[PDB]
């Protein structure tokens, strides 16, 4: 109840970058490395002028990783002794990343510390992360993350309350009286799900989702939370409030280790859900990543809706969703390597399509400027301007509202969408841990070759067709808001039939090659053929023009999705 504020002299580290997605180290780093977490928490609290701390609220929560509660305890001690007026924390420390974004904008907080390492595994031998979100509810941008890192290199003391202890399991206010401070420190413990449910309730028709999900004629759904943070949201919204039967909530109790495996969503990693969905007993499966920003969408028998098709089908039936009826469509966005299925829909409906470089800030900027309603990422990311993060459970409810409106299966919707818009066959090849100089040279040469003036027009034949290069560059994007220029974001081979090949090198232990292949077909004799077969021509073309085997020694990507 009554705590001393004490100051501790510290030794600064040199690698405490927040990055675009939070500071991530092994839990063992955050556990053994002395004051490692205490340092970085101080560094960021030092980003806000001391004059505004009493008036300031941070929301903090996390995805349930091992070491989370201890770290929220830690945020509290530094928050108090530095003059921050209020923390509002998820019950048990539980806050999905969409929920944090929601609460920040709802209570007009100055921002939030999210304890999440997203897909990376949690556990005593796992990873742990600390992300900072600012007052618009979205990720701390570069200028704030630079100041913070600059501070973490110099940090030689932090202010703390060594004996403060928050009870995260009980709801309501906790008031902490700092001895030799006048204004108290107040923590508000809130229900993990309520503010976020209250938001979803406002954008969807829960009445209609309740009709479709209940009764003897309900569609059967299985929602796999991968033992992460969305578990309680599924059970409390999907099962308790719109009345889905209890067994729909698969792996919906958060575990400190996420159940052994890592909370990353794909057809290999959520095979849990996939085996269930192969039954053909359920009409719709979904699976979420660890902090709830990503989603995979499944159909009857495990029909797979690839994320770039997903964002397109949502765009195609967007007014099924009350939120968009009232807002209208301010525009569509998708990362550059995402398939152009969404483009086909934005082109039919004459709505702006922004092709963004991978990363959130480009989506966020467009939302802040009221020109972006629905954004999509090939990497299981789907979001809307209801917040400033991507939102997994939200994508599921959009799909459910569309199923309700449309009264077809997931698969018949995709077939009609393809038949009506043509299909963007799509895959991405991951080459993990390739040798860097080879990787870098491969891009270097393929860039040089693309820049020669004879390259546009160069034809390539395959077992049937000829693709012709319409354009070929390293992707550069001029942000229409903050004015930034982002360059060297990916080699694009644009073919005249609407197909593309794009190469990228990842940034987050060696070098990893991503090769995205977007083969577009409009003929209903090609439309429902096997995707890896129709993608093979462009895959052969891609590998030959990059000489990727010759530069990496690989015959096969690590991972195909």
| Residues annotated as catalytic (active site), given as ranges | 118
In a 3-state reduction of DSSP, which class is residue 300? helix
Smallest distance, Ca ion to C-beta of residue 118, A: 4
Alpha-carbon 475 to chain mean position? 22
Smallest distance, Ca ion to C-beta of residue 193, A: 18
43 — phi, psi (to 5°)?
Answer: -55, -40
Ranges within 261-290 binding Ca ion (CB under 5 A): 289
Distance CA 63, CA 60 (A): 11
Query: With 0-12 CB in 10 A as exposed, 13-18 as middle and 19+ as buried, what is 507?
Result: exposed
Q: Which is nearer to Ca ion, 256 or 412 (CB)?
A: 256
Q: Which stretch binds Ca ion (CB under 5 A): 293-301, 443-451, 470-478, 481-489?
A: 293-301
452 is in an annotated binding site: no
Count of residues near Ca ion by CB under 5 A: 4
Q: Which is nearer to Ca ion, 21 or 152 (CB)?
A: 21
447 is in an annotated binding site: no
Smallest distance, Ca ion to C-beta of residue 483, A: 28
47 is in an annotated binding site: no
Per-residue interface string for the shown chain with Ca ion, residues 117-146, x marking contact by CB under 5 A: -x----------------------------
Smallest distance, Ca ion to C-beta of residue 147, A: 25
487 is in an annotated binding site: no
293 is in an annotated binding site: yes
101 is in an annotated binding site: no
Ranges within 90-119 binding Ca ion (CB under 5 A): 118
End-to-end alpha carbon distance in the chain? 53
- CB-hemisphere CA count at 13 Å for 479? 20
Distance CA 186, CA 355 (A): 44
Distance CA 528, CA 519 (A): 13
Q: Which is nearer to Ca ion, 95 or 414 (CB)?
A: 95
Distance CA 448, CA 442 (A): 10
Distance CA 75, CA 66 (A): 16
Which residue lies nearest Ca ion, judged by its C-beta?
Answer: 118
Q: Which is nearer to Ca ion, 71 or 450 (CB)?
A: 71
- Tell me how far CA of residue 449 lies from CA of 446, 453, 472, 476, 477, in angstroms: 5, 9, 9, 18, 21
Q: Which is nearer to Ca ion, 119 or 504 (CB)?
A: 119
For the chain, helix (H) and strand (E) counts, in that order, are 18, 28
Q: Which is nearer to Ca ion, 291 or 378 (CB)?
A: 291
Q: Which of 205, 283, 291, 521 binds Ca ion (CB under 5 A)?
A: 291
Residue 293 interacts with Ca ion (CB under 5 A): yes or no: yes
157 is in an annotated binding site: no
Give the position of tokens 């309900």: 218
Residue 63 interacts with Ca ion (CB under 5 A): yes or no: no
Residue 224 interacts with Ca ion (CB under 5 A): yes or no: no
Smallest distance, Ca ion to C-beta of residue 104, A: 17
Give the position of tokens 């900027």: 365
Q: Which residues contact 51 (CB under 8 A, 6 or more apart)?
A: none
Query: Which residues fall in the annotated binding site for alpha-D-glucose 1,6-bisphosphate?
Result: 24, 118, 293-294, 358, 377, 379, 390
**Where do contacts with Ca ion occur on this chain (CB under 5 A)?**
118, 289, 291, 293
Query: Which residues fall in the annotated binding site for Mg(2+)?
Result: 118, 289, 291, 293
């Amino acid at each position: 109840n009554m705590v001393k504020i004490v100051t501790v002299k510290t030794q600064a580290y040199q690698d405490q970058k927040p990055g675009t997605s939070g500071l991530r180290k092994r839990v063992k780093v955050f556990q053994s490395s002395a004051n490692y977490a205490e340092n970085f928490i101080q560094s960021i609290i030092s980003t806000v002028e001391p004059a505004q701390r009493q008036e300031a609220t941070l929301v903090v929560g996390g995805d349930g990783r091992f070491y989370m509660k201890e770290a929220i305890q830690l945020i509290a001690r530094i928050a108090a002794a530095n003059g921050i007026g209020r923390l509002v924390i998820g019950q048990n420390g539980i806050l999905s990343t969409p929920a944090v974004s929601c609460i920040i904008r709802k209570i007009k907080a100055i921002g939030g510390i999210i304890l999440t390492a997203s897909h990376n595994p949690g556990g005593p031998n796992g990873d742990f992360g600390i992300k900072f979100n600012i007052s618009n509810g979205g990720p701390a941008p570069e200028a704030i993350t630079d100041k913070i890192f600059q501070i973490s290199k110099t940090i030689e003391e932090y202010a703390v309350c060594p004996d403060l202890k928050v009870d995260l399991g009980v709801l309501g206010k906790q008031q902490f009286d700092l001895e030799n401070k006048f204004k108290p420190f107040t923590v508000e413990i809130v229900d993990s799900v309520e503010a976020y449910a209250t938001m979803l309730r406002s954008i969807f028709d829960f009445s209609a989702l309740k009709e479709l999900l209940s009764g003897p004629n309900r569609l059967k759904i299985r929602i796999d939370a991968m033992h992460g943070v969305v578990g309680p949201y599924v059970k409390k919204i999907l099962c308790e409030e719109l009345g889905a039967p209890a067994n729909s909530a698969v792996n919906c109790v958060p575990l400190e280790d996420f159940g052994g495996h890592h909370p990353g969503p794909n057809l290999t990693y959520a095979a849990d859900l996939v085996e269930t969905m192969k039954s053909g007993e359920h009409d719709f499966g979904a699976a979420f990543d660890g902090d709830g920003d990503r989603n995979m969408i499944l159909g009857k028998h495990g029909f797979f809706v690839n994320p770039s098709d997903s964002v397109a089908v949502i765009a195609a039936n967007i007014f099924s969703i009350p939120y968009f009826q009232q807002t209208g469509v301010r525009g569509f966005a998708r990362s550059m390597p995402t398939s152009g299925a969404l483009d086909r829909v934005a082109s039919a409906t004459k709505i702006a399509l922004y092709e963004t470089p991978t990363g959130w800030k480009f989506f966020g900027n467009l939302m802040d400027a009221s020109k972006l309603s629905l954004c999509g990422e090939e990497s299981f990311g789907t979001g809307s301007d209801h917040i400033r993060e991507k939102d997994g459970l939200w994508a599921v409810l959009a799909w459910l509202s569309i199923l309700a409106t449309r009264k077809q299966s997931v698969e018949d919707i995709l077939k009609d969408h393809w038949q009506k818009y043509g299909r963007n066959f799509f895959t991405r090849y991951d080459y993990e841990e390739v040798e860097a100089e080879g990787a870098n040279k491969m891009m270097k040469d393929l860039e040089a070759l693309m820049f020669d003036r004879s390259f546009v027009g160069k034809q390539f034949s395959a077992n049937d067709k000829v693709y012709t290069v319409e354009k070929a560059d390293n992707f550069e994007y001029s942000d229409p808001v903050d004015g930034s220029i982002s360059r060297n974001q990916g080699l694009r081979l644009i073919f005249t039939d609407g197909s593309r090949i794009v190469f990228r090198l990842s940034g987050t232990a060696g070098a990893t090659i991503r090769l995205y292949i977007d083969s577009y077909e409009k003929d209903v004799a090609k439309i429902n053929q096997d995707p890896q077969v129709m993608l093979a021509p462009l895959i052969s073309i891609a590998l030959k023009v990059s000489q990727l085997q010759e530069r990496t020694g690989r015959t096969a990507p690590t991972v195909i999705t």
